Amino acid sequence: PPISLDLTXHLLREVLELARAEQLAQQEHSKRKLLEII
Hints:
Number of helices: 1
Structural class: little secondary structure
Number of strands: 0
Shape: rod-shaped
Helix content: 10-25%
């Protein structure tokens, strides 16, 4: 009964699907400054 070698590959698509865009899909827009203006 091995460990850390079965449900790992899932981390290469599941964890990459979330927790990655959550920190670049909202605030990042406030960085663009395309049509915001003060």
